[PDB]
Structure formats: structure tokens, C-alpha cells
Design a protein around this ligand. Sequence first.
Ligand SMILES: [Co+2]
Ligand SMILES: [Co+2]
Ligand SMILES: [K+]
Length: 304
Amino acid sequence: YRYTGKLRPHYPLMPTRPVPSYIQRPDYADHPLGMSESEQALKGTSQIKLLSSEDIEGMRLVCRLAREVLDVAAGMIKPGVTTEEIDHAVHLACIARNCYPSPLNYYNFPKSCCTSVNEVICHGIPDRRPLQEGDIVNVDITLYRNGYHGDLNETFFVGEVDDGARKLVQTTYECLMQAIDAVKPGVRYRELGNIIQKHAQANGFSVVRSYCGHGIHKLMHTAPNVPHYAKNKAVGVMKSGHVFTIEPMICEGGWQDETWPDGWTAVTRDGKRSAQFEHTLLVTDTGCEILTRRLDSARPHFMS
Ligand SMILES: [Co+2]
Ligand SMILES: [Co+2]
Ligand SMILES: [K+]
């Protein structure tokens, strides 16, 4: 394998961390290849659930708990801390909130969150590399509680970073918020990509194509698929009661991605940096509710 950048995996990984059996488990947690019956059952469908009031309560709770866990990780971002240490804290925080860490054994993913440093676009595996000053790092948290999944992510600065890093992170968040601001009944899921790409282009950044936002509730990833790039073919129309994520991945260089031999880590083919932000959204009559919103601050962590 020829690596695309300066980053390398730092193995071995610590033994898989246990989840006490009192925590309720999604189907894939105990499947030997980490496959999910329920997701596959509905794979290939365009149909989009309309959540009940019970579903909404469930989605509100788990999305709030997920935000709390993301906030735990945010407080640990500093030079010298390894992504594995962050994942340990995250794993414990999920447990402490009576949630299962959704990534854990999802298609045999070996950790409890994804940490994506620099040229890692998404799905990085927490490992023994200490974070380095100048790094940008995204931590993506998904929790599962009472049958529902909640999903959010943010990119962070590791001490002082260069102007390029500042601009890429800022613009990515701005891409996210502009998309969210367009969400309400009757808007085509395919429109968000035009908004996202138009802002990214304008700042000289490109937009990852192979990964998208998604529906989420009782399944972790389901309809709708939601691309973040312009002129896309996504299918469907927003409606009050839909829940989905928007999670744009934006890059300094080109848009093309490839996967490390670990089968997960998605990196820029050119080795340039990528940043991402993500919220789980509920479409309401007037617009949408940001279920994974930060409660103790108007702003993401990187703005402090
Ligand atoms: Co996510
Ligand atoms: Co997501
Ligand atoms: K990254």
C-alpha cells in the first residue's frame, strides 16, 4: 500500500473494549461480521420513515446524549493525546449514559468512535498516534439507546494550526449551517449538495463524493441518501417527521478518496486535509430541529 500523506496507522490496537451486558445492543453488535439484519432488510429502498411522537422522543434523547459524549471528547483534544485515549473516554461516556457506542463492531469496525486526522476524510480508527500540534481532528460519535441511534461530528484544532486549517474548518462548518438553513418540508434532498458545493468551491475547496449524509433512527444508515456535492441524483423530498444527517466532508486539494488496507480509513488520494461537521436533523412544519445541537454554547468547539 502506498500511503497518500504523512499519516500512518499506529498498531497494535488495545484489545476490543467490553460493553457491559446491561446496555442494550443493536442487532449487529453480536453478528460475527458486524452485519445488521434490519438495515439490510431495507437496503436499496427509497422510502423514508415518518417518525411517531414516540420516535421523536427517542431521537431527541439519544441525540442529546451523543452531543454530551462529543463534548467529552472535545475537552481532550490537545497535543500528545492519542486517538485511542479519546476513544477510551468516549466508550466510557457512552456506557455511563446507558448507551451502546454504535460504531463498535458495525461491520466489524473495532472502536467506539471514528477519529479522522488531517488527510483522513472519515472513518479513521482510533490508534496509538499522539495528536500533533498543527493537526486537525474530527471525532464522530454515534450512540444507541432504546432502539434509536443519534449521530454528530465536529473537527477540532490541536493547539495552534495554520491559516489554511482555519479556513478549511470554518468553511466546512459554514457549508453545514447553510445546508441546514435550507431544510424544511418540500425541499428536495438533492438540493443540499448545490448549496454545499457552491460555498466550498467559492473558497477553493472541493467536496467528497463517495460518502453522504443519511437517514437515521432505528437503523444507523438508511434512506435518504444525502450527497454533499452539486447536481447530484439524490432521491426524495423533505417532509415533517423525516430525520436525517447532513455531514459534509470538504478538502483542500481534490475530492477523490481511497481506503486504507484496514478497510475503513478514507483518505484524500492527494494527501491534503479534509474537514467535516455533522448534525442529525428532524424536519418540522416550519423548518428543522437540530437534535444534536450544542446546549451550553451557540457555537462549535473550534470557535472558542
Ligand atoms: Co457520524
Ligand atoms: Co452520519
Ligand atoms: K480530517
